[PDB]
């Protein structure tokens, strides 16, 4: 169990994280998140994305029983955190630091549709960042150095934490705003 955070050097908090913890600087929170607001560490779903894993339109909720509101998608729906292309640090917090296979990060294609559900077609499915977990338990906070692709305006980053000893993964979408 865990979530994408910005407690130390993380560039941007996960969408679910902002349902419970206010954003750095602005103090913004995501609203109307439903039950997952009390358990942001619990966006757990089937592993194997994108070959299997959560179906289109259920990526942000990971098909979770508690997180269906995260699948809502409009250009105005979610708090957007500023980002720039190039090297950035992504950060996870683990309330339970399970044995880990890897972490993978995907970004929306340039002309993705912000008013349609998130789908495989919305994302560049070649991850822009992969961090090996080596099938061991990580520390309860990790920092990943990733090279963020060039984009303009609102984009969504999908951070996938694949747990090594279950058939599940944790899925945290991140709403980001590039210049323009
Ligand atoms: Cu867990
Ligand atoms: K609510
Ligand atoms: K609720
Ligand atoms: K699977
Ligand atoms: K479900
Ligand atoms: K797994």
Author numbering: 24 to 203
Task: Give me lines lifted from the publication on this model.
This includes the backbone carbonyl groups of Val186, Thr189, and Ala191 as well as the side chain carboxylate of Asp185. In addition, coordination by the side chain carboxylate of Asp70, located in the L2 region, is key to binding. In contrast, monovalent cations appear to confer only small stabilizing or destabilizing effects on GbpA, with equivalent trends observed for Na+ and K+. The role of K+ remains enigmatic.
In addition, GbpA is an important colonization factor associated with bacterial pathogenicity, allowing the binding to mucins in the host intestine. The oxidative activity of LPMOs depends on a copper ion bound by a histidine brace motif.
